[PDB]
Write a protein that binds this ligand. Structure first.
Ligand SMILES: CN1CCN(c2ccccc2CNc2ccc(C(N)=O)cn2)CC1
Ligand SMILES: CN1CCN(c2ccccc2CNc2ccc(C(N)=O)cn2)CC1
Lengths: 236, 236
């Protein structure tokens, strides 16, 4: 299932970071992921290609100018055809988590609008945007890194591109590293013991680092047992 | 206060997205922010510049090879000199928020280690890493976008580069947009009424979208009043 993502950004060249490198770069080269960018600067008509404008009511900051942004969005929507969801990345949006990534990945077409300055006119959110999303409770200089982050996350769900708990520890060569050894179970070749060890480690690490994540899970019988074991060993 | 950030990454060219564009690009050109990258591939000695290795205990994935990564980290630490904090970006890390960004921004030097494949040997976390951080509860193909996100966030705190509530709505030209008008208060020129309107909007939007954020604040007398007003109007 091909995925198409339209991007609206004053800095389209930033997106080379995902389209030219790594797993996402491969997805693009192999036509599994298409990323198409429109720059509001290209939709300006004045001599200096003005893309910002003053906020009504005053204030220190600027907003994105409505007309070039609106025209870029409309062009992206035309190219997308039917069924594209338009996403605005902002701190006031729905907070992204893996469940949310899974939801967004169900779309074959997305348009991502990247805000700069103090953001965009509220009426454009009403008239052009379908959903607002945040990548976390922190503040950035633009919506491009959030857009790139979202693209990377949803790209993992495209066929051919590649449980709620934190990952277990992993080990590779050498057998001894600054005096630290590899857990003997991992060298035992006993697949079941190894699986159970990894699962128990994941449960232990989730409990110690992010206990609230556990509360949101319905643990299996096996997970309940291994978690109890890990907690017992912790209190020993 | 200059900030220096060392980066360890198999894809250093991704960081052009922050060093060549926008506010962070300006910070770099003006020597307010320095971003220096080391690529583990450059620290390999075999003919094919191998940077991955097999996990003990088996499994579908690979890990970053220890020796080239360790040598890159040591080189970065040497260049940083005294006082650099080494950060590993991973989903099992402390979840980043703006308070956390503020904490990390207090450092004049940071080294950011970007994991690929299934991540890095656990013993390297013990021996080389000071802190693990996550940019959110979702899964990406590498630590580069998280590293870039962190750089952008902390760069906003560097002098010369540029309250817990969501932002108010903002408006710019035109006065009427698809029939939608600008709130008359914003056209009134009454600075105090405008300030109070913006604050009330911020409180209202935070309450409606992210009520848990409010619980973590000690609201001022004025904020308590405007929030009560907004809630009263909502229930009217
Ligand atoms: C000082 N303000 C500048 C403009 N801004 C803003 C506002 C609206 C849209 C885009 C931006 C660009 N910034 C972003 C974007 C997303 C995130 C996220 N968490 O997903 C963090 N930051 C908010 C901050
Ligand atoms: C399937 N695994 C591949 C390897 N991995 C991993 C593990 C450890 C370090 C880096 C990575 C790179 N991925 C990241 C990194 C950070 C975040 C974040 N939320 O800050 C999300 N993803 C976890 C997922």
């Amino acid at each position: 299932s091909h995925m198409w993502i339209g991007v609206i950004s004053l800095f389209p060249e930033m997106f080379k970071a995902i389209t030219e490198f790594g797993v996402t770069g491969r997805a693009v080269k192999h036509n599994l992921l298409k990323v198409e960018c429109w720059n509001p600067r290209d939709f300006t008509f004045d001599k200096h290609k003005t893309v910002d404008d003053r906020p009504y009511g005053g204030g220190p900051g600027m907003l994105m100018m409505v007309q070039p942004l609106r025209d870029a969005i409309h062009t992206a929507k035309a190219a997308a055809g039917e069924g594209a969801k338009v996403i605005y990345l902002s701190p006031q949006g729905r907070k992204l988590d893996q469940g949310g990534v899974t939801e967004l990945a169900q779309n074959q077409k997305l348009i991502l609008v990247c805000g700069r300055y103090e953001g965009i006119d509220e009426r454009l959110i009403q008239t052009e945007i379908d959903e607002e999303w945040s990548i976390g409770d922190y503040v950035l200089t633009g919506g491009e890194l959030p857009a790139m982050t979202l693209i990377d996350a949803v790209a993992r769900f495209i066929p051919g591109v590649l449980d709620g708990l934190l990952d277990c520890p992993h080990y590779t060569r050498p057998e001894v590293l600054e005096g630290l050894t590899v857990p003997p179970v991992l060298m035992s070749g006993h697949h079941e013991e190894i699986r159970k060890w990894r699962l128990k480690q994941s449960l232990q690490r989730t409990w110690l680092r992010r206990p609230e994540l556990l509360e949101g899970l319905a643990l299996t019988d096996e997970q309940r047992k291994l978690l109890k074991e890990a907690q017992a060993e912790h209190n020993s």
